[model samples]
Each structure stands twice: as structure tokens, then as C-alpha cells.
Target chain A: SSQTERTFIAVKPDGVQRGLVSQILSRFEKKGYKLVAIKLVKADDKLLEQHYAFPKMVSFMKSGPILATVWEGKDVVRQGRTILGATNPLGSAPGTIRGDFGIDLGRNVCHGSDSVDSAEREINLWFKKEELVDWESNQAKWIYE
Target chain B: SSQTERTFIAVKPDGVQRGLVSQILSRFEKKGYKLVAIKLVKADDKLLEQHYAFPKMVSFMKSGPILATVWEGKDVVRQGRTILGATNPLGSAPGTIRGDFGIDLGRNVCHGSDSVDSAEREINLWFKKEELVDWESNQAKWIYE
Candidate 1:
């Protein structure tokens, strides 16, 4: 049975500009997680600065659009990270999201929260009060506890 | 200028089963489009039948799980078709995701809506209210009209 946890997943400017949205989302869907919330929104310079903001990372996000998503399920934060692979795409393994496609750290294909707190923070930025969908899938019984 | 359109995109069971979720998404992200909604739920027998319930089609879906997605953008339906290429992986031209990694139609790597209506229908079935995201990307002005 699956547990219910939440995480923030985003297909960054590099990812969207590159045309991998479907492929990126498909990866999550096929993994047996719920489709919590997704949207095509322009990230504010302020938000990007805060989200990817860190001491040494001068070039966190370069420019352009990004898709911010909220995923719900048990261990989703860890599982989602597993799906994104390493931060640097070059170092990622072949089967992982980064391993196969990632070539640069700054231009990495996608981004996932390292912890639940970030997930919570991101879910707020992307989705409004009414954006979170609460529904039952026919296969819910099989995927969840 | 990009036209507002829809497309049906799916990440085959193999892509998901193998754990290449973000890798695949990165591809589309680079091409420039929006991920409206997505999920990682198992396709039931009935939904599967309806999705592939084309008039003169053989049942290729009877095989296994699939990753369904809703892509929105200017000429997205057509662009998806272009990016995805032919259903028969062998026939798909090189450089495409399928052409590079796809094996055959029976196990063809992915799927995309050929027309506008198909995109809407597929999106409705797969995504719910909270499933779709609504926001503006800074780079969107350049990518779409």
C-alpha cells in the first residue's frame, strides 16, 4: 500500500523550453501517484530567487517559463527525488530523469524539492485555494493503503 | 505565433515501469509548451477502451499500463504529432524520442493527439479541476503568441 505525502515538482524553463512536459508528467503518472495540481505559470524573479536561492548558487534559474506541480502520495518527496535523479544531469544515471537527459547543472531538465517543507512552500506559489483537486480514481484502492 | 490547441500524449508502460519519468519530461520542456495536467494512475480496462476506442483501430492498449498527459499550446496537437512521429517506432524518423529509443508499435514508446478534439477529450478524461494549473511564465510571451 502507498502512503500519502506531498512534494513540489517543476519542469524548469530549460525543461519547458525544451519541450519535455508530457514526457516529464508521464513519468509521474506511470509511477502510480495522484495528479495533485499542475499549471503553466511564469515564475516570478522573486519566487525563483527564493526557491532555488542559496548562498553560492549565483545562476539558480537563468530565464523563461517553468511548470510548477504538486504531487501527493506516501514518500512522494523521496520518490519524486528518485525520479528526478541527481542535481547535475551529467552525473545522473541512464534510467533516471537526469541520467538520460540532463547535461548541465544550471540547465538541468527538471527540479524536485529535497524535503517536505519546500514542497509545501512551492504548492502555495503555484496553486490557489481552489486549485487542489480532491477526487477518487477507480484504481485508487490498488495504489493506496 | 502559437495557436491554442490540445494533444494527447502518453508515456508507454515501459517508460514508466523503467523509471524514466523526468528524463522524458525534460525533452518536451525544451520544445516549448505547457503541461496543463498529469497523473500517475493506472488505466482501467474501461478507460483504456474508451481512450483507444477509435473506429477502425486494433486494441494495442490491451497490453498494459500507460502514462497519459494533456499538453496545451499553439499548435500543440500538431507539434506533439511531429515530435512523437509515427506510431511504429521503427518507422519514426531518427532524432525523435521514439526514433531514438522506441522499439515497435506494439510497444511504441509514446502517443500524441492527432487533432484538436482528441486533445480536449483526453484532457477531460484524465485531468480534473485541481489537476490543471493556471499561471503565467515570464518566458511564455516569447514561446507562445
Candidate 2:
């Protein structure tokens, strides 16, 4: 559906340090989202600042190599947030990513762009045109109504 | 540490039909487990029956293509089961695969070998020696205590 939206999601340094790249990716993939782009890279302050103005977000992003990804699906921005759970792991529900893996506010396991506009800004900041993979999933026929 | 164990996990036909192969694989990868072998295949009746004597299990497994996988890691059989959640999705916790994504026992998203012995047996029945992959991850050091 052209109504599909794309969102930028990241497994932060702590998530990576804790070995959660695949787990985070699994949630979106299982929810019938398409993986458009993915990579493990150490973010630079310049680029991190473009994505988030907060110094803490920038610093945490720069702390280690993160698994940055773009997922495409209907209502993806909002759905991604739902899968990610609350910003604080403590407040997240059991089935959500943060609810399952995260603990302290300082070490929330992952991040997802909060809105479509924010997704556009972050997706551009983190991925180049070539990094995105456009392809067809045979399973798509059954995944959506 | 050679405490590494191998377990058999499968993204059932429903899981594949739902497009959850990557999601299922991601949980193990993020847990610091190694992917020894994996493939999407239609389960034969003989193989399914050998794995489980239950006619319903055999029938459901044969209903569609499944991603059969072997993951190696510390206490993998136990850990894999933990990652997979309870047999009934309703009983699985929110953070688990079934807990997060499953709603029915008939539609439970995936399967894992139940014990060390069962893992060994299932792995042998499903994978040939040539099908396994052995490699090291740079992040393993951080993943294990």
C-alpha cells in the first residue's frame, strides 16, 4: 500500500553492547515490516546532532557502533513506537522491546522515530540513497489483509 | 567457553506466512547465539513425525514452509526456549516472541528444542554436517560473562 510509511530505528550502543541487534530487528520483521536499510556504524557527533539536538542522544549514539535500520509498513512510525515500548524500560509493557530488555532510563535498549516527519529527517540523516534495499517479500501476500 | 550448545528452532509456517523469519533469527543473534545452519523448507511427514509423534504437530508443520535453524550458544536449549516463550502464547510473557506476537496456541509463532538431548537429536535429524556454519563474532566477548 502506498499508505505505507518508513521509519528509522536504532539499536543504541547499550543495546549493541548488550547484544540486541537481532532481537530488535526481529520484532519489526515479525510484525510484517520490510527491512529497507540496515547497517552497524559508529555515529559521528555531527550526524547525531542532525538527528537529535539533545547532547545526551548524540553522545549515547556516538558511544559505540549501533545497528541503524529503516523499516517500511503501514502506519510504521506509530507501530514502531508501539513495538519499542515506552522510552523508559521500566514503564514499558512486557511484550515490547524496552519492556523486555531495557532497565535504566539511561540505557533504554532501542529508539524509533516518533512521527512520520521525524522519521523522514532521521532516515535521511542516517542512510544514504544507495544503502536502502528495495525488494519484494514473497510472504507479503499473506501478511496484510 | 565451550559451554556452547546447539538447539533446533523453527519459524513455523505461520511465522513464515506472517513474515517472521528475520524476527525469529534476530532474537538468537541478539542473544549472542551463533547461527550454525538455517533454511526455509517444507517439512516432510517423515521428518515431522520423527521430531514429534503428534499427528497435529506433523500436520501443522507440513502446512507451509518453515525456517529451520540451528543456534549454538551457552545453554542454548534452555536459552532458546526462554526466547521462544511458552508453548501456549497466552501463557508467554510480553517480552517473549510468543508473548509479544502470538495470540493462539494453534498459531504459536515458533518452536525450539526442549532440552540438551532433544536439541542434539533434532539438530541431527534436520541438518546435515555440510549445512552448518561456524564463525566467530567480534561482539561475543561482551555477550558472555
Candidate 3:
């Protein structure tokens, strides 16, 4: 049975500007994680506050449009974190998201909610319930053990 | 106008073994590059030698299956290299592929041809003329400046 966990990930403004969105999304898709929801949005200050309480964080988030996404799979939260690399790109592994595409701490290429609880909260804050899709991938059988 | 250049990339056996094919492909896709052609196959020593003459390199390449891909975009050779990061992951920046996911020099996750000439040769060696897809993406306008 599918562990059926979910996580929230986002490509930040810099990532979009640098043309890294598809590259980022395809990583999860190839890993057998299902894309439940995804959209390009220009987040406002109020919504940014809902996701992060730090003013510095909110300001940076509001700098540009970001691609917000929800992914589903077994142990998706933990797995997603591993795929994202480290929060500080310097510490990220080469295969992880941060390790692969990020540079500056202020302009890390993407964000993955750190925990199941945070994932739920971020997913709710960034996406409307209807925006999230419920579906399955035909290749799921070959992706997971 | 779009540069419409092409490049060659491969998710090496180690990358495939680590289940990073999708993740690697996504990076190019998110950049708005078109997937010209792609496939999974094991490489033989002769073909591997054409790409790299080093004995050790050939041995590693033949270790298992690899996902070979052709991508088309503006300045794809240069741009594609940027996406791949440094050849040695230790020195690669976080946002690039090797920088993010790679660890050992011998086990770097993927490869992008370093020059247009090399790209053409690699593409010719790895894929056939018919295997390359000539197509367009509706989202092209949003991807380029």
C-alpha cells in the first residue's frame, strides 16, 4: 500500500527567473511522486505572513511570483526533504534540490515544508482546496519498491 | 528569438540507480527546454570510449543503465552546463545538478556535453536522427525573455 503522505514545495522567484521550474518539478515527477497541485502565483504580504512569521522571510517571499506545488507519495514529507537538499545550499547534497540549484541563502531556489504538520499548514495557506488535484500516475508501479 | 540550440545530457547509471532520472529531467523541463529525445539503455565500452577515452570512465559508464536525453533551447550547450553544475560536485554550486545531488567524482549523477560540437557528437552516438523530437511547447512565451 502507498504510504500516501504529502508535502508542499515551491520554486521561489529567483528560481523562476533563472528558468529552473520545470527542472525542479521534473525531479519529483521522475521519482514517482505524484503532483497533486501546482500553480504560478505572486504571493502577497498577508499570505506570506501565514506561511512565515519572520518579516525578512515574508519580504523575500513577496519579491516575485513563485510556483507552488503539492506532491503525494509514501513518506513524501521525509523524502521530499531529502530531495530538496539542505536549507543552506552550502550544506546541501549534490543530488538534493538545494544542493543542485540553490546558491544564496536569501535566494534559495525552492522550499519544501520541513514536517508533515508544516506541509499541511503551508499547503492550506498557499493553495485553495479545489486547486489541489486528486489523481494517480500509471508509472507508480515501477517507481516504488 | 530563441537560440534554438541543442545539447546532450545523460542521467548516468548511478543517477538512475538512485532514482534521479525524473528529478534530473525536471530541471531541463522547468527551464522551458524541450525534450528532443530520451531513452534508457546500457552503454558498451566502445561507445563509452567515444565520449571519454579514460579506462576508468568507461568502466563506470558501463556499470549499469543510463537515461540518455537530447534537449533543445536557447544556448542549450552553455545553459545546460550551468544546470549540470561543475563536473566535480565538490566545487559545484548548490543550484546546479552535480552541485546538488552529486557526491563522489566517479559517481556524479549526470552529464551534459561541454560544447556544441561535443553535444552533436554525443547526440549522434547516443541517439538516432529519428529518435530526436522536433516539437514546440505552448508555454514557450512564458519561459524566455
Return the TM-score for chain B, candidate 3: 0.92
- For all candidates in order, the CA lDDT equals 0.68, 0.77, 0.80
TM-score of each: 0.55, 0.55, 0.52
Fraction of real interface contacts that model 2 preserves = 0.34
Highest lDDT, which number? 3
Higher-scoring candidate on lDDT, 1 or 3: 3
lDDT of 1 by residue, A1-145 (tens): 4455788888887776666666777777777776666665555567667655454343435455567777777899999999989898878777787787779887888889888887887778666756675444445677665
Q: What clash count goes with each model? A: 32, 5, 24
lDDT of 3 by residue, B1-145 (tens): 6557789999989999998889889777755578989999999767776667355777778888999999987667876787888899998887678977898888899989888999998899998898887867664533433
Candidate 2 lDDT, tens digit per residue, B1-145?
7856888888887887666767677778766776666655667777876777444766777777666778788888998899889999999998889998899998998989988888888888987775565545557777777
lDDT of 3 by residue, A1-145 (tens): 8557889989988787777788899899988889999889999867876566544666566767899999999899988888887786546655666655554456568888888999998898888898888866788778767
Which residue segments of model 1 deviate by more than 4 Å?
A1-145, B54-65
Ranking by lDDT: 3, 2, 1
Report the Cα lDDT for residue A113, model 3.
81
